[PDB]
């Protein structure tokens, strides 16, 4: 059944190198869904952060339609190993490092719906660059993004669009694996740009990270007040015993330095 | 089964010399599959009682492409999770008190996927925090008291004590 349906599709002349045809010659429209699993290692020094997500791409390839209207056949057939299919050569423009998960069987899924609609799902670990602005460092908010776009195909061949409903989703155990920040807001936007090699379509998801204050309250502010307050208890020592005053004023000043360091 | 580890952040198979796998095909058609795997899993921790806390770390196992109609996971009936004898000895900082074997099947946007989950419970060893934190702090607070026995005229001695013990206290916490 499934194995036969797949066989039928590729027994004919099918080229995974050839872009899927369109009715008006328009570009292949790729709908994108994105599921963040974990956002970790938010490096302020190198201004980057890590994040593992599930990319989900969906386009139409009439050449792959087997059931068409179907209603007598399986809704979709799972693409098995050894069958090539044209896929959007998407990459992450602001990715500095990236890995696919391949433990046991590779972590991918490809479905070929009867009408020719393809679903593509893959786990990807990324290390993205996120320029940060520390003007209010102790109490700041940063905005980190993931950019997704085609590398070779221009605006005439491939166009990205965020899924209509819930384009960006978060796994339930994400905020719990992110102790130092609070993921307050997320946004789903377009970053299509015009380059020297052409105009390339591009999506951009953005998360907003609010830095947790409890740490800075306890490790910075509290202890500094407690340090300044100590320098005051020397106002109550007799003006004759200066050794006591200097010892206080100097030790609290030195400690202040260390703390800041 | 195209099984993967949902909460795995990094994973390696061992391939020194011949790859570390074993596949048996019993006469009745039953297949056995055995493979060594090194993992780096995410384990959200809760430090409310940090010095004396217990964390619970898990390993999730599930199919990636096959849904609930094609593949279903079930823990072996007898001793689903086993530990090697030299495990607790290679884990000096904690004590692996309890383990559990559970199911984490979930309903996603791409379908309903079967999923297992093993869980180990780690109790943080106290001897270290007793010696490196509690003992030395008491020994530090107690020193600040020996200045109550110096004559009220020699304040330089009292301040020197009270301030040095306070500063040291800071460093220790840092």
């Amino acid at each position: 059944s499934d194995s036969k349906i797949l066989a039928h599709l590729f027994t004919s002349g099918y080229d995974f190198r050839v872009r899927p045809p369109t009715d008006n010659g328009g570009p292949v429209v790729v709908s994108v869904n994105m599921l963040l699993r974990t956002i970790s290692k938010i490096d302020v020094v190198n201004m980057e952060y890590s994040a593992q997500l599930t990319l989900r791409e969906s386009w139409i390839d009439k050449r792959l339609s087997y059931g068409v209207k179907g209603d007598g056949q399986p809704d979709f057939v799972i693409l098995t190993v050894g069958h090539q299919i044209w896929m959007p050569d998407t990459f992450f423009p602001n990715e500095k490092q990236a890995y696919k998960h391949t433990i046991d069987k590779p972590n991918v899924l490809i479905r070929i719906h009867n009408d020719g609609t393809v679903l593509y799902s893959v786990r990807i670990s990324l290390v993205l660059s996120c320029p940060m602005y520390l003007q209010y460092y102790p109490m700041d908010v940063q905005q980190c993004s993931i950019d997704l776009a085609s590398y070779a195909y221009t605006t005439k061949d491939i166009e990205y669009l965020w899924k209509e409903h819930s384009p960006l989703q978060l796994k339930v155990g994400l905020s719990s694996s992110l102790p130092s920040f609070q993921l307050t807001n997320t946004s789903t936007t377009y970053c299509t740009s015009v380059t020297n090699t052409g105009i390339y379509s591009c999506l951009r998801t953005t998360i907003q990270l609010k830095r947790e204050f409890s740490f800075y309250l306890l490790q910075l502010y509290i202890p500094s007040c407690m340090l300044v307050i100590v320098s005051w208890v020397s106002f109550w020592f007799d003006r004759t015993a200066i050794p006591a005053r200097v010892t206080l004023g100097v030790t609290t000043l030195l400690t202040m330095t260390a703390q800041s360091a | 089964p195209d099984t993967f580890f949902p909460n795995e952040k990094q994973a390696y198979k061992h391939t020194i010399d011949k790859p570390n796998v074993l596949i048996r095909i019993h006469n009745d058609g039953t297949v056995l599959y055995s493979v060594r795997i090194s993992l780096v899993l995410s384990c959200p921790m809760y430090l409310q009682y940090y010095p004396m806390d217990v964390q619970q770390c898990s390993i999730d196992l599930a199919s990636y492409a096959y849904t609930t109609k094609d593949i279903e996971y079930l823990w072996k009936e007898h001793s689903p999770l086993q530990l090697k004898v030299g495990l607790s000895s290679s884990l000096p900082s904690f004590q692996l008190t309890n383990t559990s074997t559970t199911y984490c099947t979930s309903v996603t946007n791409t379908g309903i996927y079967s999923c297992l989950r093993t869980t180990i419970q780690l109790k943080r060893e106290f001897s270290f925090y007793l010696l490196q934190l509690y003992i030395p702090s008491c020994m530090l607070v107690i020193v600040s008291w020996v200045s109550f026995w110096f004559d009220r005229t020699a304040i330089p001695a009292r301040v020197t004590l009270g301030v040095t013990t306070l500063l040291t206290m800071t460093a220790q916490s840092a």
Partner: antibody
Amino acid sequence: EVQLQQSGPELVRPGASMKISCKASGYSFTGYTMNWVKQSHGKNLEWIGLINPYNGGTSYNQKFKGKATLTVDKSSSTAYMELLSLTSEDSAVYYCARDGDYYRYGRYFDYWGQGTTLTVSS
Amino acid sequence: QAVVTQESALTTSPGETVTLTCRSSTGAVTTINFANWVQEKPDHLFTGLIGGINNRAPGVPARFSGSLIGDKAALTITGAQTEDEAIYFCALWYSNHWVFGGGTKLTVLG
């Protein structure tokens, strides 16, 4: 105590479509997935489908594929069910039944609603 | 397709031990059927009892218990009570959906 309160009884003409609700209270709404069960005079209990509040995800009985549309409104802790192209056969009592497990699918029923009686007659 | 079968009705006295059974037409009820048991009191009051692997609903009395006696799912009430008189539906999971039984009408003789 947890409670699932469903909308009142409805009377609608064939060809039309109506939507019944299931307002959940007494628990973290987004943690448990919701089932919808149809009890008709003509047959036994039928399982329509289920939806995961937190996820948006749904899974329908092949039978009701296209007849029912499960949705969820997180803000109001309510689960809704659309019923399209209503006919005589759709005249039944529709229950909503919560799944047992917390932020995971346990495949076992907790609490049901009082049911919603839908009457489709021209 | 697949059909679930139950006793039309059963009778038992307060304190005794009754057992309802749930039968699959395709074969023996296995663990991947996640046999569920639901109770229906008069006036359309549904509540779950057992289900999933070996878990039970919040508050389900200790007298209720699930098992796979023979080759079908069972629901044993050890020490039946007056209020235990209701209609019991069992549901089996077949691949991707639930299939309910006809239900068993348990009567506690008073």
